Amino acid sequence: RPDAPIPYDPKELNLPLQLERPIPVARLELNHQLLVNERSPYHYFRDAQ
């Protein structure tokens, strides 16, 4: 609900996502605990379109 949203972390603030009406949402984020060949996952996806 854009007029009654849920925070990503109940200990911090974020900006509400701007939708015209309530819709279900899915979040895909990178895993920060992983290290493959001593490199981050971002190293593999910074240049992807």
Partner: protein, 247 residues
């Protein structure tokens, strides 16, 4: 939607084949958010710096200057050609930088940062260890100089304590407050006979030229009063890259 640091976001249009994630490529960034701005205008900013905390291995090269930007509805724009004077020399000494702020800075459609402010940005591409540490950043700053009217000759021998100046000689009701948060810098007293004798007796021996251990040491201690002790090393070289001295 792109999901950005600090809790922002951005809308995406697949017809233009955008990137999958937000793009970052520089070793250091500092974001500065401002309140009650009325563009176009002029901002003097004071940077107070801890001058002993930088890396002395090599001097910052020219390919790695600092870069300045301002925000315009999720797009960053360069400020490189609107800086009048930077007395901090790139954040190595304390000083005032004087920025001119143009009229097309924007805050209607910002979503990647707090929409209640205006935003500036300073970045460094590499070797971020050659930037000093910070004590404060302030607006509405100006520099003033001491003017003598028959005072003690020993005034200039010690710095002015922080918090001394708070009043105007002819007060005005439009100004509500004046503050002096740090001490003064750069004073020196007029010579007395004993120091006169010391200086001239040393010059009568080294003639103002540096050819021997005695000459290098005394020519430095006289010109730079902020040094306490110095040592001259003969036939020795220092390698900056290794931090090794060749004897």
């Amino acid at each position: 939607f792109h999901l950005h640091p600090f809790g922002g976001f951005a809308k995406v249009n697949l017809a233009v084949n955008p990137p999958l994630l937000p793009y970052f490529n520089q070793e250091g960034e500092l974001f500065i958010g401002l309140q009650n701005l009325d563009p176009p205008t002029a901002l003097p900013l004071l940077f107070q710096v801890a001058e002993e905390t930088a890396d002395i291995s090599l001097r910052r090269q020219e390919e790695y200057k600092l870069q300045w930007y301002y925000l315009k509805d999720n797009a960053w724009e360069s400020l490189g050609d609107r800086i009048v004077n930077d007395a901090s020399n790139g954040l190595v000494t304390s000083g005032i930088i004087n920025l001119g702020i143009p009229a097309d800075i924007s805050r209607n459609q910002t979503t990647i940062l707090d929409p209640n402010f205006h935003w500036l940005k300073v970045t460094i591409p590499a070797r971020s260890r050659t930037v000093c540490e910070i004590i404060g950043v302030h607006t509405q700053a100006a520099r003033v100089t001491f003017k003598d009217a028959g005072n003690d000759p020993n005034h200039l021998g010690s710095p002015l304590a922080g918090g001394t100046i708070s009043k105007l000689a002819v007060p005005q009701p439009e100004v509500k407050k004046i503050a002096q948060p740090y001490t003064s810098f750069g004073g020196r007293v007029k010579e007395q006979p004993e120091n006169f004798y010391i200086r001239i007796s040393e010059r009568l021996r080294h003639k103002g030229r540096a050819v021997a251990i005695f000459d290098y040491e005394r020519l430095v201690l006289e010109k730079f009063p902020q040094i306490y002790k110095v040592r001259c090393i003969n036939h020795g070289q220092f390698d900056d890259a290794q931090e090794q001295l060749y004897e």
